[PDB]
Design a protein around this ligand. Sequence first.
Ligand SMILES: Nc1ncnc2c1ncn2[C@@H]1O[C@H](COP(=O)(O)OP(=O)(O)NP(=O)(O)O)[C@@H](O)[C@H]1O
Ligand SMILES: [Mg+2]
Ligand code: NA
Ligand code: NA
Ligand code: NA
Length: 321
Amino acid sequence: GAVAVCVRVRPLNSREESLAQVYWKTDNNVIYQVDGSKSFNFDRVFHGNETTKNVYEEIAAPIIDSAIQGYNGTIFAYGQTASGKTYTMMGSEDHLGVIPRAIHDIFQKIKKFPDREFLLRVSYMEIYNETITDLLCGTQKMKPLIIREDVNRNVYVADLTEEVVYTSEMALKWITKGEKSRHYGETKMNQRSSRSHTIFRMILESREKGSVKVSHLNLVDLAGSERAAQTGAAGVRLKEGCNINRSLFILGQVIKKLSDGFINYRDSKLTRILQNSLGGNPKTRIICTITPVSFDETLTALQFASTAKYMKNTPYVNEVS
Ligand SMILES: Nc1ncnc2c1ncn2[C@@H]1O[C@H](COP(=O)(O)OP(=O)(O)NP(=O)(O)O)[C@@H](O)[C@H]1O
Ligand SMILES: [Mg+2]
Ligand code: NA
Ligand code: NA
Ligand code: NA
């Protein structure tokens, strides 16, 4: 249970219906090529009519449980542009994503431990064109942030704000504030493409009401692979795509090296800041989002998700003074 990988297949979108061959079909564990021999097995495959409540309760809720018990937990959404990462991780008021569901779930679950005092604090950062910025601190205080390595060789983002929250409502208002500064852009593939990697973090601390359990819960919505022939991107949008594709290539190389056996975490800000999530001291989950009418991008995503199944994390309960 240190590392687990699932797939989420979305329904077809407006763009795909205006066209498309279905390359992929699924059951709850296997995604297989329609008129070919390729197949991939996962601990869970979600189909197009399964909701983000199903994804949340099966994949994320146990990671929230482990965070309350003092384990670091990280959930990544990975997949091609317009495959469903932001839909799954953030969603909307109409149908909540993993991030807002985790907030409600945390505030409800900590009431089961009245003999424990909880302190919760949130951070929200973006990695855009290999620059790290604080989405919470408001525009006038935004600046490129530095990754440092502390006395225990833990990596951290220097001067990233951490906001104490006492209600679900307060946490959700911080997410809203951060979303205002997040980089989005219009392409032919997604009218609201995520042009950066985003990391929503909760630090959960608890102690007996009478030592302190500390968990970092990192909920990560990656940018997605994209091609100029599909996006019609030019100028800054096209530059963003190049940067995104480069960063995902590096994440795949780090995952491949971990699966085999030194590890090139330093080649991207994303692999450096989440090094502890990739072979380290946390429980990591990967939600691989795919569209079934893609062959090459879906194949790349399934091969990444397959390789990540073999990543060896060694999580333990984090207890300090
Ligand atoms: N499971 C789903 N069910 C229904 N609609 C979905 C689903 N997944 C995605 N969508 C739709 O597809 C749109 C684009 O999905 P979105 O999550 O923004 O893509 P993405 O993977 O985040 N792409 P990008 O940020 O460009 O790399 C959403 O706004 C929804 O309309
Ligand atoms: Mg997105
Ligand atoms: Na097959
Ligand atoms: Na087959
Ligand atoms: Na990027």
